[PDB]
């Protein structure tokens, strides 16, 4: 992901996906598991959490924020409680993405 | 020339978005189809209402470009590529109001900015225009990013009726587009000096 | 309460507190706040997750999760020929901040503040009368998408008067 256009992805996230994520979480929050220290490394984790289904929330990769995430990477890179939990994890990796060089 | 225009509007009557297109004649058996940059479907066909075509949907990705085609059965007469996120038409402001403040010797102009309560495009630049209601005059324009401003009494002729209106345009590093329709015009009167 | 001051230090206010970055060994507060304990101040790291243990209280976030920036250092006001006012200030030493610029007529109330927002390090306020006096103040506000919803804006700068 080191060759990705991070500026474009940031604009899509800031203006769309971020709002989609916070909208779905509706104030619900948890604790993260893993972090990242670079944009390429963060994008890798973000992509993995977002587009790979997990037990208890198979529909995650089909959520709007997820489809939009998929399209942004494509374009710029060469139980309800479980859904919410994962969404919180993904969101916090974005924060790390934003704060990383 | 079968040229046409389109504009989008975000979060119109909920979370849904509105796409509107129209020809620059007769809509004889002509249809508008948009393909690409949609969430769950390959294409959508717009709904015709009098002289314009529209679709209200949650399907827009707001990422990447779409092909908008005028079609007859299956023949493309004309297709243009454009991104929904770059043809966003702002919503007009509302509740335009003018109050004369004698102590300040000015007019306080207020209005409501609907985007402030919305999710994607919250920030717009406003354009307030005013001039005397009677006779010919160049409108005076004021550019703002906030929703109150003042007009000094001395800036205006006394004992006259003014017309005033306001519009908005997107101001976002991702979302781009067009000036809103003008708000309804209000009028106010200036007192004697 | 937990506040990360300007991404330099983390200040915890409420007992004994332990902390660590990453998955290393918990460490004691390097400089407790003591009565005459009321809190603790520890160093902020730009990366890695800060774990706090007061177990009576637990937390685990980047220090930036609680970001409260210092106020902008010095505000300048420049009347343009357009009839607009350009408000400018020095940049912070880190990204991800919006700046809120407030103005009001100098005679007006504390409830008459008008707000505009934008990125570093200046913005324009239009439609102001050139013969009137205005008060301006600024604060830095961490972007929700950048730092999250647990971050908070700086205090307002001292008022700067324009004539």
Curated annotation (Swiss-Prot), chain A:
Superkingdom, taxonomy of origin: Eukaryota
Q: Which residues of the full protein are shown?
A: 22 to 139 of 140
In which compartments does the protein localize? Secreted
- Species this protein is from: Mus musculus (Mouse)
Asked if the record carries the keyword Phosphoprotein, the reply is no
Q: What is this protein called?
A: Thymic stromal lymphopoietin
Function text:
Cytokine that induces the release of T-cell-attracting chemokines from monocytes and, in particular, enhances the maturation of CD11c(+) dendritic cells. Can induce allergic inflammation by directly activating mast cells.
Q: List the disulfide bonds.
A: 4-77, 36-42, 57-83
Gene Ontology CC terms: extracellular space
List glycan-bearing residues: 5, 85
Curated annotation (Swiss-Prot), chain B:
The glycosylation sites annotated in the UniProt record are 24, 76, 138
> What name has this protein been given in UniProt?
Interleukin-7 receptor subunit alpha
Top-level taxon of the source organism: Eukaryota
Cystine pairs annotated here are 6-21, 35-43, 69-79
Map motif WSXWS motif onto the chain: 179-183
Q: In which tissues is it expressed?
A: Spleen, thymus and fetal liver.
Q: Which residues lie on this side of the membrane: Extracellular?
A: 1-193
Q: Which organism is it from?
A: Mus musculus
Q: How does it assemble?
A: The IL7 receptor is a heterodimer of IL7R and IL2RG. The TSLP receptor is a heterodimer of CRLF2 and IL7R. Interacts with CD53.
Record-stated family: Belongs to the type I cytokine receptor family. Type 4 subfamily.
Post-translational modifications: N-glycosylated IL-7Ralpha binds IL7 300-fold more tightly than the unglycosylated form. Ubiquitinated by MARCHF8; leading to lysosomal degradation.
Comment text on domains: The WSXWS motif appears to be necessary for proper protein folding and thereby efficient intracellular transport and cell-surface receptor binding. The box 1 motif is required for JAK interaction and/or activation.
Described by its record, this protein's role is as follows: Receptor for interleukin-7. Also acts as a receptor for thymic stromal lymphopoietin (TSLP).
> Could you tell me which residue ranges the Fibronectin type-III domain spans?
92-193
Q: Where in the cell is it found?
A: Membrane
Swiss-Prot record, chain C:
Tell me the residue ranges located in the Extracellular compartment per UniProt: 1-163
In the induction comment, the record states: Up-regulated in the myeloid 32D cell line by granulocyte colony-stimulating factor (G-CSF).
Q: List the GO biological process terms.
A: inflammatory response
Decide whether keyword Transmembrane is in the record.
Answer: yes
Disulfide bond annotation, renumbered to this chain: 29-40, 120-121
Locus of motif WSXWS motif: 153-157
Q: Glycosylated where?
A: 74
Tissue specificity note: High level of expression in liver, lung and testis. Also expressed in heart, brain, spleen, thymus and bone marrow. Highly expressed in progenitors and myeloid cells. Isoform 2 is expressed in primary hemotopoietic cells.
Keyword list, A-Z: Cell membrane, Disulfide bond, Glycoprotein, Membrane, Receptor, Secreted, Signal, Transmembrane, Transmembrane helix
**Which Gene Ontology terms of cellular component type are present?**
external side of plasma membrane; extracellular region
Please state every residue range assigned to the domain named Fibronectin type-III: 71-163
Quick check: keyword Lipid biosynthesis in the entry? no
Assembly mode: The TSLP receptor is a heterodimer of CRLF2 and IL7R. Binding of TSLP to CRLF2/TSLPR is a mechanistic prerequisite for recruitment of IL7R to the high-affinity ternary complex.
Q: What is known of its domains?
A: The WSXWS motif appears to be necessary for proper protein folding and thereby efficient intracellular transport and cell-surface receptor binding. The box 1 motif is required for JAK interaction and/or activation.
Protein function? Receptor for thymic stromal lymphopoietin (TSLP). Forms a functional complex with TSLP and IL7R which is capable of stimulating cell proliferation through activation of STAT3 and STAT5. Also activates JAK2. Implicated in the development of the hematopoietic system.
Family per similarity comment: Belongs to the type I cytokine receptor family. Type 5 subfamily.
Q: What is the name attached to this protein's record?
A: Cytokine receptor-like factor 2
Q: Which organism is it from?
A: Mus musculus (Mouse)
Name of encoding gene:
Crlf2
Entire protein: which part is shown? 30 to 211 of 359
């Amino acid at each position: 992901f080191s060759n990705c256009n991070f500026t474009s992805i940031t604009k899509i996230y800031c203006n769309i996906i971020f709002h989609d994520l916070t909208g779905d979480l509706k104030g619900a929050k948890f604790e993260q598991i893993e972090d990242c220290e670079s944009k390429p490394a963060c994008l890798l984790k973000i992509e993995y959490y977002t587009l790979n289904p997990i037990p208890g929330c198979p529909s995650l990769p089909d959520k709007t924020f997820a489809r939009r995430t998929r399209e942004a990477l494509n374009d710029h890179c060469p139980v309800q409680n479980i859904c919410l939990q994962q969404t919180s994890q993904i969101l916090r990796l974005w924060y790390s993405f934003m704060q990383s060089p | 020339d079968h040229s046409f225009w389109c504009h989008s509007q975000l979060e119109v009557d909920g979370s849904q978005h509105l796409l509107t297109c129209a020809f620059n004649i007769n809509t004889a058996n002509l249809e508008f189809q948009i393909c690409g940059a949609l969430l769950r479907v390959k294409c959508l066909t717009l709904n015709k209402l009098q002289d314009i075509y529209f679709i209200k949907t949650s399907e827009f990705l707001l990422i990447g470009s779409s092909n908008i085609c005028v079609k007859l059965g299956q023949k493309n007469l004309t297709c243009k590529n454009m991104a929904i996120n770059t043809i966003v038409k702002a919503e007009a402001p509302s509740d335009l109001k003018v109050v004369y403040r004698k102590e300040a010797n000015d007019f306080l102009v207020t209005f409501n900015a609907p985007h402030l309560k919305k999710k994607y495009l919250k920030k717009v630049k406003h354009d307030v225009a005013y001039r005397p209601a009677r006779g010919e005059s160049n409108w005076t324009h004021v550019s703002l990013f906030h929703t109150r401003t003042t007009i000094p009494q001395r800036k205006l002729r006394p004992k006259a009726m003014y017309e005033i209106k306001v519009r908005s345009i997107p101001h976002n590093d991702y979302f781009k587009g067009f000036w809103s329709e003008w708000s309804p015009s209000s009028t106010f009167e200036t007192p004697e000096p | 309460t937990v506040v990360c001051h300007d991404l330099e230090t983390v200040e915890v206010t409420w007992l004994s507190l332990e902390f660590r970055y990453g998955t290393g060994a918990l460490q004691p507060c390097p400089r407790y706040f003591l009565s005459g304990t009321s809190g603790c101040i520890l160093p902020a790291a730009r990366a890695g997750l800060l774990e706090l243990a007061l177990m009576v209280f637990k937390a685990r976030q980047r220090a930036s999760a609680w970001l409260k920036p210092r106020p902008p250092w010095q505000v300048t006001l420049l009347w343009t020929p357009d009839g607009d006012v350009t408000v400018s200030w020095p940049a912070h030493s880190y990204l991800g901040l919006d700046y809120e610029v407030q103005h009001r007529e100098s005679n007006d109330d504390e409830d008459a503040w008008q707000t505009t927002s934008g990125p570093c390090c200046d913005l324009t306020v239009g439609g102001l009368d050139p013969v009137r006096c205005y008060d301006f103040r600024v604060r830095a506000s961490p972007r929700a998408a950048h730092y999250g919803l647990e971050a908070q804006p700086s205090e307002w700068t001292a008022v700067t008067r324009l004539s």
